[PDB]
Design a binder for this molecule. Structure first.
Ligand SMILES: Nc1ncnc2c1ncn2[C@@H]1O[C@H](COP(=O)(O)O)[C@@H](O)[C@H]1O
Length: 535
């Protein structure tokens, strides 16, 4: 029996082993804050970009007051809440307040627009939506009005800022009240996957498996009470939230420092000002920082650990990290779906430069299979399948995609092409999944194609990746025009997609027009050939 339907729990035999092995410790996710504020109440837990800071005891108390305020509004006990917030202290307090109210955060990114928000609010049956007022020039309150129009279940909008006709997140406050703990085997939160189908997909993560994710990652990355972790990626991104991210920093009693952007102007000042020891970035930001140190004067000496993940970091810039930035590189090949691969902090430099790490857990299980689903010879390239104590057995409320994406014995098909080396380290070699990886941002080709084909000058669309030296892939939209009509150019299509509510990172970099698509025998559009036909 579970608070939430729509997800796929682990078979009992596996759950017993993970509990026996100490992975699943039986504590709700919010307890990592409760426990740390009990042991170290006066340590500095969180610093924002303005220099304001909060102790563990202050964070813990404020999460209790906001949880009490959430219950006064009728939000708790299994209700799904879409959270779209920037890297501010407001996100951190709300995350734990939602957990302690019994609500299930549905974490979205500030870049997401109407199509993503409506779909995940509609899938989750969300009853509340948390937004900023204006962020990066965009009024999210307008988006929250469109969302309430399309999703009647949304009864409350909480605004971090000028709430307009909605509720101000700062007024969600009340005298703490006894609140029961959730079952640690229940879903704790729902993450977004970029996905590979026509609609984004929600990832259920339980208290037990997400606490393990955080705890085990913190151990592998050497996170301790002397760690000062700079949150450069969005707080709601799995990498910056839990690998080990801010949750690992708070669990071990370190200091979380929130960066408003990854620009050297913002990040280098915070690293010097707060003596940041660890941070995580995607390869395009790594390249930028590696460049910027030759004209920035900031003292970055306090840096000890640079995690780089989301897409593959090249061997040449990876070798540059110690000379240029004076810190240890750690390559992280992970996914919101679960499996994390880490290079170890004292791995030989050869393996930090050339590989994307090895699995986090002793009980992460790895298969590498060919196109016939058969295991490959050792060291050959094939598709990575994985099963383990923090990898999901199914997406939330997605039974048709679950039937395609997990094997009968519960192996998740990652869609990544890898080699496994004799030491156990993986090298990422490519992708099988139809998803473009644009600087770490994931674009489901089928979702984008459906959006584009809605344009009246478009009959058919095939979205193809293009190699890019600093972003990895860019997005090409290959179009068949609507009969007797002219297909749009790049800027017009971009404006169409933005008004439709498509996130900005999914807008095509290039448009190619053609009368027909290359098809394989079997009849599917040949995207390997499109990659050849187009440029
Ligand atoms: N270090 C890395 N190298 C190459 N690809 C990566 C790496 N980390 C993550 N990915 C890709 O990102 C996907 C999941 O990303 P996300 O769910 O956004 O964390 C994986 O399945 C890989 O395709």
């Amino acid at each position: 029996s579970h608070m939430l339907d729509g997800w796929v729990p682990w078979p009992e035999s596996f759950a017993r082993r993970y509990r026996a092995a100490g992975y699943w410790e039986g504590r709700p996710l919010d307890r990592l804050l409760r426990e740390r504020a009990a042991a170290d109440p006066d340590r500095i837990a969180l610093v924002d970009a303005a220099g304001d800071r909060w102790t563990y005891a202050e964070l813990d108390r404020h999460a209790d007051r906001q949880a009490a305020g959430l219950r006064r509004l009728g939000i708790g006990a299994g209700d799904r809440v879409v959270v779209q917030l920037p890297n501010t202290d407001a996100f951190v307090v709300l995350f734990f307040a939602l957990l302690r109210a019994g609500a299930v955060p549905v974490l979205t990114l500030p870049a997401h627009r109407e199509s993503e928000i409506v779909h995940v609010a509609e899938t989750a049956g969300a009853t509340a939506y948390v937004i900023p007022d204006v962020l990066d020039g965009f009024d999210h309150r307008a988006l929250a009005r469109a969302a309430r129009k399309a999703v009647p279940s949304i009864e409350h909008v909480l605004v971090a800022g000028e709430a307009a006709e909605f509720t101000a997140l700062a007024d969600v406050d009340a005298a703490p009240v006894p609140l029961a703990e959730p079952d640690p085997g229940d879903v704790a939160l729902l993450l977004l996957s970029g996905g590979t189908t026509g609609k984004p997909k929600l990832i259920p993560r339980t208290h037990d498996d997400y606490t393990y994710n955080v705890r085990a990652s913190a151990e592998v990355c050497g996170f301790d009470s002397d760690t000062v972790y700079l949150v450069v990626l969005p707080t709601a991104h799995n990498f910056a939230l839990a690998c080990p991210g801010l949750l690992g920093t708070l669990m071990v009693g370190g200091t979380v420092v929130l960066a408003p952007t990854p620009s050297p102007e913002d990040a280098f000042e915070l690293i010097e000002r707060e003596k940041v020891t660890a941070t995580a970035v995607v390869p395009p930001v790594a390249l930028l920082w590696l460049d910027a140190v030759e004209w920035e004067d900031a003292d970055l000496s306090s840096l000890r650990l640079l995690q780089v993940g989301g897409s593959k970091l090249g061997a040449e810039p990876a070798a540059r990290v110690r000379p240029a930035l004076g810190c240890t590189l750690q390559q992280v090949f992970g996914m919101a779906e679960g499996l994390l691969n880490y290079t170890r902090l004292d791995d030989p430099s050869d393996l930090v430069i050339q590989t994307q790490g090895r699995p986090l857990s002793p009980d992460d299980e790895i298969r590498v299979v060919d196109e016939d689903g058969r295991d490959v010879a050792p060291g050959e390239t094939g598709e990575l399948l994985t099963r383990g104590p923090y990898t999901l057995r199914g997406y939330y409320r997605a039974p048709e995609h679950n039937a395609r994406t997990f094997s009968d014995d519960g192996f998740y098909r990652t869609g990544d092409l890898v080699r496994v080396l004799p030491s156990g380290h993986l090298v990422v070699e490519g992708r099988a999944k139809d998803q473009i990886n644009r600087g770490g941002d994931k674009i489901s080709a089928e979702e984008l194609e459906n959006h584009i084909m809605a344009h009246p000058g478009v009959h058919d669309a095939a979205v193809v990746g293009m190699p890019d030296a600093t972003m990895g892939e860019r997005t090409c939209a290959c179009l068949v025009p609507r009969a007797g009509r002219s297909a749009p150019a790049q800027r017009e299509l971009a404006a169409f997609l933005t008004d439709r509510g498509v996130a900005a990172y999914k807008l095509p970099d290039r448009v190619e027009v053609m009368d027909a698509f290359p098809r394989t025998s079997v009849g599917k559009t040949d995207k390997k050939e499109l990659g050849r036909r187009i440029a």
